[model samples]
Target chain A: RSAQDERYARYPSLAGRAVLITGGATGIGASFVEHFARQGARVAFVDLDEQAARALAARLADAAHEPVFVACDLTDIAALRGAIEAIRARIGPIAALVNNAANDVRHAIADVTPDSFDACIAVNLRHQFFAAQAVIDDMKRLGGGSIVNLGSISWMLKNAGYPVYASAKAAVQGLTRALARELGPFGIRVNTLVPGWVMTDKQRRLWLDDAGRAAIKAGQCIDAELLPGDLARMALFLAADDSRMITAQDVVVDGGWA
Target chain B: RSAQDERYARYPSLAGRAVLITGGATGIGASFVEHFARQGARVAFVDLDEQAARALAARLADAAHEPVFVACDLTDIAALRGAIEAIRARIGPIAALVNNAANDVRHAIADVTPDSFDACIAVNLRHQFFAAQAVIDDMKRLGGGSIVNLGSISWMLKNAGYPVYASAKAAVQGLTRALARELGPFGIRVNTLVPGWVMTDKQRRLWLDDAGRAAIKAGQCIDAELLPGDLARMALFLAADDSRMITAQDVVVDGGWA
Candidate 1:
């Protein structure tokens, strides 16, 4: 048998598995939804844009498995918690969670204020905490689970812009470690999936002007364009039984941006 | 001159420079205290062990400059802030800040209570945040400064039985990134010093059993015993102008634990 065959011989299909992803309307999150569903998992997502969610859900129908899409703002804790409960009731219990929602901004230190700072923290950090909290009971009932929080290489690189975003992203690393410790005995694994300069359409249109692309290409060791599929593949690895022992750590899928 | 030679040509001395080191009574913290004092920095420390503090202070004394020791409980935020200010008043504007106070308890997730978890966070994570906040104004006034937060490789490795400690160490990584961005405009750099399996006296006595030492030696690529001095040397380099551009990253000094 091949190495992967031997590895998967132990843990069978994730066919009946249920997964919840945040910010799954577009970009990397949407790719995660597609890949997991293709693996026969019952994938679901929360997004603010109703049209985008509906479109993705329809696309999932033609794919391997149909997905559930909830239109609600994740920052609203009560609404978010209620939506999670509804998902658990509608589909099976959530066996996996991908906290992928983040508000990427390019605010400098001088521009940050109490209001903007709190908004940034809430959007990027606090929602992940609450979503993880909301899913704990379901995971406990299911006897085990995996959580992948989306982190950024920009935080590690300490880029000049996006001060608050970097801070909030770094905080997610803290949360991942703490939650891993707190939930390990329950057989739950928690890790952060750190992406480096993903060439998403929005990033290309807005941020990756020619100069930015050149800087990223120069910084990264791998010259290949980093696609959402690359991240989705890594996410699948983390969510599956292959990564059972890997917890309280970060996996960089950034093409080696040192 | 060679680039390295030219680099050291700046920062002729840390002489008369003020530094505040938290948890400076023992282990790596004590080493940092000695190293900075020997380099002519006016060192002040806040630690709980009064006798140990006094002894360490006396050990590093010169006629021109003497290290100061203040007995303060760092878990209490208000008291810790007061002690930080007292250090500023006694010495000149603080030139460097090192958050090195950390305590670890070996327990599984089932045994970790809310109170115990919070205590771990307070000791290992919260103090670093408060210490940096207290030092930011002085650092800005001085036109530049360095802040090093002590992190552990336990969070990075697959170690068992130190879940809370590992979590707290990961939080230090987050704090370093955030602070680096927030304080970068004022020329302050925040970075984490990650050490692996340093053979401290207490660790040798209590934690480092034969099995543990053998395991560490087998894992590390280098065939040398990890010492506080090795870490201190890296800290000195980072604190000096030689590493002015480096911030918001972890310098892993673990004898190459690949």
Candidate 2:
């Protein structure tokens, strides 16, 4: 609803659709939550930060259905399931699940431990499978659904710092592939949105250094900082019936980087 | 080393370099085995079918080093590790590994079980990871190495029937991505070679039907059947020093289908 550009896409398919998102408390995930809400989607989200969710919900309250935020640790399978159930009770059968929660805490290979590896995969990868699994019946009941799992350009770039996180993103591709075919029979569409390094507040604060800036200038074909909205726009199109035929695909929205 | 118009390339880099392949007994895997061997590389391979391997080695016995075939089930991790040791001992530290062994046994979603899913991943996906892991030290010691994993177009096309196989291929991409970066400091390059429907004898005998013929005719930009040799040519390039800068990429050998 920025009055600047009529050229931006509008999806009638997203209106009133029951859409669920993970990590929607902040950053790019919050952007997804807001965009879907603006499109009149019945939005439900889970995250560790409830205050940010409240702010996000309030900002979008004037649009359509009030965006619902449920605080849940996505790493905990049962809590995530319960959160999903409560979300379904509030809304209806989820028409889409945006598995967007991710943590890219950087560590060297020597810095890796068994516990850390398990934690990394748990937050960044395993939850994606379990979250989709929990929502399968809801999608089946809806007779159609869409799943958008957050993948990364970091892995594609063969990024060195966060080896485990990068690997987890790569592994998610397999998870999406199997599930895409498994669910395609019911008109369930699954895709991995491999995002470029979006210039989010958190990234700029914690990670972005001179090398990061240099890489951005050198890597991206488009000379611009990738934003949360860049990813959000694609999520809307992918979630909508407009991209019905696209499934089991890694849709990169990285402004031409890996 | 074909003399057809002399347009074909010859990689000076491949000569005497140790190259290893999986599922190198027959089909496209064998083509990779043969092509690498013919490039004057010290070739070694592991496969369940020893007789086919023996025949293959004999066929190319006059190469720089007569290809060594070792019998091992790739799905068995310990056996695969031991096989890697045996190969390293004979060939003296592998410089490249073509992770090309895959089984595309079709099964519906209803036909899939916990056991079947694990088997599918083990044969089609997991070995790529373990194999690459086992060879890291050799690559590091050699100053550089290449890993070419056999990904598939099935998941890319959202191809039905072999749903699990497609997923496993998708998953392999992620494995390659993580490893590519993890090993990048040592100059180890990792990539996935996604092949289109290559017309092999077993495929023509068991899988290819009227529908498949029709699909290939409709789908490919190139009219000719994608042969094992077509994939073999690309594998050589990726394994050789020519593509040393390339890593964590999916090189599609499809005639233009998915």
Candidate 3:
């Protein structure tokens, strides 16, 4: 039997290239890490949970290059740079940067302060910017690169919680455009990959109630669990040469929710 | 003879509502001022150009409440607040706000300095935030309000020039969501009115060229010219009670291009 699936596409352009991801040792990001590794890319990732990160790397030991895991607090910009540098030293000049780290904790408007406001931007939006800035030279050296920033549909749905995150999420689309405009001449493309409500173990335990089930059925045009793999499949497509002309776009993987 | 067009819609809820528009003296916004006045709304406007503002108000003198114009630099937050207060006195508690002022001047990525970056954000995004903040209490007092933030298709299209402005424009969508989530229970609504390019006098003079005509044909689903009146007509619907349940949405008035 062939190691690769017959039905799925194999992007020849992805082979042997270096790819990076943030908060990628768990859940949806984990799938992104897994997909890139399976494509024969020299993959590396940063995450807060070293235990999960180590386990994930070990699990993928059979790949062309087992994904290198570096523990990092991405909100710390200085630390983020160091972690990225470490990943670069291992993987070579990065060909794609998946800006995927974020915390979508729920909070109220009155509960927010200057500290929380900055904190939310730091985790969700700020790291995405500095991560791209840190990797610009790598892409420049290689003559081209792709930056796939993670986005959410909360803003579109007016999800009652995480107002700060909704705002922070919105800016990524802007940042994608800004970067795409600046970097298009250089062959670097930037786009926001917005996922609808995804079902992860953490979400199932914490947030997914009967109401969640109802919304999954009613809100999405397709009645099915929004798996991390679906997002990963789209992510891989975007990372490959197949989407070269598609820049500065918000590619929503929502099952037709706004 | 019927004074108003029998074919067009007249929003009943818009009558007697205190509506505000920024940069309302010229072109698209001038149309907004005229239309709101025609619908019997107590209208007020703010613009940097005193001459145009005064003339537009004079031109609409036959309306239910004469359109009041206040000249102010919207970049200055304090000035924007004072101007809002002045207009509130002229009309009443603001019921709707059209955040429509922006400078989309073309510039290269390499040419942008920190000064220019801040300048672009100030011009395009900052005022929208402060304007909403200033009017939130008024909206709460009135038990409801509508905030129609002007958005562009530039970010969606990955327009090459004005990288800073494109990013600034993207955040308005996020801000709309954030505010919508926080204010939904209070019956206040926030939405972005994204328009495909309309041929205004300034745009016709400064930007439109031979390539522009070709782009217009290739891009828009409909071949006819996009006018200021079309956008104004839709603006009235969002402002009125007809769309009471709609919140945190981007209502595109484009002829079918995203």
The lDDT for every candidate, in the order shown, is 0.77, 0.82, 0.81
Between which residue pairs do clashes occur in model 2? Answer: A170-B174, A174-B171
Under CAPRI classification, how is model 1 graded? incorrect
Ranking of candidates on TM-score, top first: 2, 3, 1
Candidate No. with top TM-score: 2
What are the per-residue Cα lDDT tens digits for candidate 3 across A17-117?
A: 89999989887888888888887889999999899889888988999999999888988999999998988888899889999989998899999999999
| lDDT per residue as tens, model 1, A9-101 | 111335667899999988899888877877677888998878978987897796556899887788788888888888888786889999999
Model 2, C-alpha of B245: deviation from truth (Å): 25
Per-residue lDDT tens digits of candidate 2, residues B1-258?
A: 321113334456788989999999998888888778877789999999989999999988888789999999999999999999998899999899999898998899998999999999999999998998898899989988898999998898897898889889999888877777667667787888888888776888988998988888667543456777767867876787645555677766665457
Docking class of 3: incorrect
- Against the native complex, each candidate's DockQ, computed on alpha carbons, is 0.01, 0.02, 0.01
Question: What 10-residue stretch in candidate 2 chain B is worst by lDDT?
Answer: B1-10
Off by over 4 Å in 2: A1-5, B1-257
Off by over 4 Å in 3: A1-258, B1-4
